[PDB]
Design an enzyme around this catalytic site. Sequence first.
Site, PDB file in Angstrom:
ATOM      1  N   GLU A 163      32.549 -10.982  -1.346  1.00 46.69           N
ATOM      2  CA  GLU A 163      32.563  -9.723  -0.278  1.00 46.69           C
ATOM      3  C   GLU A 163      31.999  -8.943  -1.543  1.00 46.69           C
ATOM      4  O   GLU A 163      31.560  -8.078   0.327  1.00 46.69           O
ATOM      5  CB  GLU A 163      34.485  -9.340  -0.821  1.00 46.69           C
ATOM      6  CG  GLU A 163      35.062  -8.825  -0.639  1.00 46.69           C
ATOM      7  CD  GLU A 163      34.141  -6.812  -1.450  1.00 46.69           C
ATOM      8  OE1 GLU A 163      34.073  -6.959  -2.272  1.00 46.69           O
ATOM      9  OE2 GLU A 163      34.591  -5.792  -1.164  1.00 46.69           O
ATOM     10  N   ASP A 210      43.297  -5.038  -2.175  1.00 41.76           N
ATOM     11  CA  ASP A 210      41.623  -4.957  -2.766  1.00 41.76           C
ATOM     12  C   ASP A 210      42.252  -4.081  -3.654  1.00 41.76           C
ATOM     13  O   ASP A 210      42.849  -2.855  -3.609  1.00 41.76           O
ATOM     14  CB  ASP A 210      41.148  -4.702  -1.598  1.00 41.76           C
ATOM     15  CG  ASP A 210      39.792  -5.141  -2.237  1.00 41.76           C
ATOM     16  OD1 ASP A 210      38.733  -4.173  -2.098  1.00 41.76           O
ATOM     17  OD2 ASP A 210      39.515  -5.560  -3.400  1.00 41.76           O
TER      18      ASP A 210
HETATM   19 ZN   LIG Z   1      33.956  -4.661  -5.961  1.00 40.64          ZN
END
Ligand SMILES: [Zn+2]
Length: 323
Positions: A163, A210
């Site tokens: 990511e 996240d």
């Molecule tokens: Zn990060």
Amino acid sequence: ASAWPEEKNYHQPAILNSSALRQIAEGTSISEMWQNDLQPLLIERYPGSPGSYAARQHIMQRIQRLQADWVLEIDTFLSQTPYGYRSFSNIISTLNPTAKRHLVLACHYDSKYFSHWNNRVFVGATDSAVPCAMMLELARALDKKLLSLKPDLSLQLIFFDGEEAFLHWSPQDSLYGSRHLAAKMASTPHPPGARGTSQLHGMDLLVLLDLIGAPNPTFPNFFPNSARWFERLQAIEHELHELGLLKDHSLEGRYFQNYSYGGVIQEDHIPFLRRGVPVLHLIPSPFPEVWHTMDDNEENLDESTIDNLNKILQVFVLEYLHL
Ligand SMILES: [Zn+2]
């Protein structure tokens, strides 16, 4: 021509009563998550590193020990990067692979690459070792209920690799695992044998976790097509609070607050959102103060906040699945 991919638009939760909410609150253990799911992930785990392999084995092992019928798949692919061609491996864990619809929880398990500095190593505790551990704790805490799935609707967990950008963010250097997986799911018929529907049509909602773990997070309601589910998180938070089931929590300092956010945030939901998948993005705004620094570590995590969010998330998932 079945209209099953439209079912998600009308899907309603089966709301838990007070007694059930107390059961869920009592059934998750932040200290067990801490020791058994989180600490093993607080290691350097950038793509292709020994830690990446260790993190993947840990995630797969913790899922495999559960009673529910999880089916694990590793999606391994090559991509060009600033450092040349490299291999990445997304982890997908699915209950009822052939069920047409799945509620999907996701996070990224890689840690951003940094060379060691003054003997410090970046471990990305909120980004996103905690989200990974929250997903593993949810699978553990809800295991007996999930075993019952063994509405053609079930649950899938995705742990994305790559990511993070290898340098600073750029369109080509970031979201390696999610860009790959979204394209792969978009071109995969679902259910098996289907003529015109894909795995993405089967994704009811993608709940992406996240940067979770710091104190006082505030999550905005980013998208109108998932706003009603954001409202459910607000309601769950409010009721767990009123029942006295959250710790060190006030409604003035609630996590899910009424307020949109017009901008775009580059994160793993982007490749899915751009292909038409509804996303509930559980990322705080603003980001944790330790974001992308060596201080994004265990010591700066807020235990009670993570515990409260585990309770809220677990309730959300049971209500969505009617369990
Ligand atoms: Zn990060």
